[PDB]
């Protein structure tokens, strides 16, 4: 029992919970996901098509499905950009840090 | 208050905790890290140089420092490969799943 492993665990159980036996995510899957787990961002965002454009930047294949790999990337782009915040605007919490900065 | 955000939070506080004002990680930083947080893997691994070789595959620049970006990737390679396990050997827990499959 650790932290990272406790985290990686969630991260791993946060994909299929929004996918299923199908094992992937469609445009409507991402949308509902980012609004069924971490709405503290997309909500106070600056566009109602954010999910649409994000979905596009995700499935570089444009078929509809989104695998765990490309998926994780999404869980990264946010964390990465979020991390950079510590390097400046600093030095449960992410719930706000996310809805705060956004980049096209 | 959510799950992913609660996770991303840890993920974010699990880097600098092993870095500091320096804001990065050296070969000795990774080693101690993977043994100060998730030892359930590198330990029952198949090589004592795993960290050395992994470190190499991480800082594609070979200077010594490892930024959060390249760092996260590490937190990915494990999770990704781990995920693939569900697709077969299935269908706190990671503590074991990690030490189980490797390159």
């Amino acid at each position: 029992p650790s932290q990272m492993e406790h985290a990686m665990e969630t991260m791993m159980f946060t994909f299929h919970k929004f996918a299923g036996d199908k094992g992937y995510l469609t445009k409507e899957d991402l949308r509902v996901l980012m609004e069924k787990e971490f709405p503290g961002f997309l909500e106070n965002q600056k566009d109602p098509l954010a999910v649409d454009k994000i979905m596009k930047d995700l499935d570089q294949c444009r078929d509809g499905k989104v695998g765990f790999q490309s998926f994780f990337s999404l869980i990264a782009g946010l964390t990465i950009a979020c991390n950079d915040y510590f390097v400046v605007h600093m030095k449960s919490t992410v719930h706000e840090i996310l809805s705060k900065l956004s980049l096209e | 208050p959510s799950q992913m955000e609660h996770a991303m939070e840890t993920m974010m506080f699990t880097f600098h905790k092993f870095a500091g004002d320096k804001g990065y990680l050296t070969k000795e930083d990774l080693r101690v890290l993977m043994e100060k947080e998730f030892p359930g893997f590198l330990e029952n691994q198949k090589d004592p140089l795993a960290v050395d070789k992994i470190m190499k595959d991480l800082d594609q620049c070979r200077d010594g420092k490892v930024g959060f970006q390249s760092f996260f990737s590490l937190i990915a390679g494990l999770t990704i490969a781990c995920n693939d396990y569900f697709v077969v050997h299935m269908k706190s827990t990671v503590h074991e799943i990690l030490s189980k499959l490797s390159l």
Partner: peptide, 10 residues
């Protein structure tokens, strides 16, 4: 596993 560079961030 194979920790390879990811693709795209934000």
């Amino acid at each position: 596993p194979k920790m390879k560079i990811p693709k795209f961030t934000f």
